[PDB]
Amino acid sequence: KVFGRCELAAAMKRHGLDNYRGYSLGNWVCAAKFESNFNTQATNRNTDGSTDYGILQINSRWWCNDGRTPGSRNLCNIPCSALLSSDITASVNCAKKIVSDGNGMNAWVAWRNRCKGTDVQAWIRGCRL
């Protein structure tokens, strides 16, 4: 499913991402826009052979199992396909583990290069939250 901007903001708020580990909602909406264009079904293969899945592009080397990433962990204990659902619960729950790992939202390259240090509240302006 392709979310609208405010529809995803509201879904993220309901699943407890707003100010999670100090990152306001706009940071999460900006990261999803630039990682997946708000498409839950987005995938992209990396040179190391791992793949990134779903609205927040969560990687199979560490976080999920896709059966084709040798030596990977599965720290979120889920098949990577669960991250492609129209229900973002599994992606949110795994993103809370990633953001708690030490580097905060710098784990998401698009957030660090396109959202960090910008006016991220713009991403939630206008929405009924």
* Active-site residue set: 35, 52
Q: For helices 5-14 and 25-36, what crossing angle results, to 10°?
A: 130
Give the interface segment with Cl ion, choosing from 8-16, 25-33, 80-88, 101-109 (CB under 5 A).
Answer: 101-109
Known binder of ligand: residue 101?
yes
Nearer of residues 86 and 113 to Cl ion, judged by Cβ? 113
DSSP alpha helix (H) spans, the chain: 5-14, 25-36, 89-99, 109-114
For residue 57, what are the contacts with CB-CB under 8 A and spacing of at least 6?
Answer: 35, 36, 42, 44, 108, 110
Should residue 110 be labelled a site residue for Cl ion when binding is judged by CB under 5 A?
yes
- Exactly one of 47, 70, 71, 113 binds Cl ion (CB under 5 A); that residue is 113
* Residue 127 contacts residue 6 (beta carbons within 8 Å): yes
Residue nearest to Cl ion (CB): 113
Nearer of residues 109 and 122 to Cl ion, judged by Cβ? 109
Point out which residues bind Cl ion (CB under 5 A): 109-110, 113
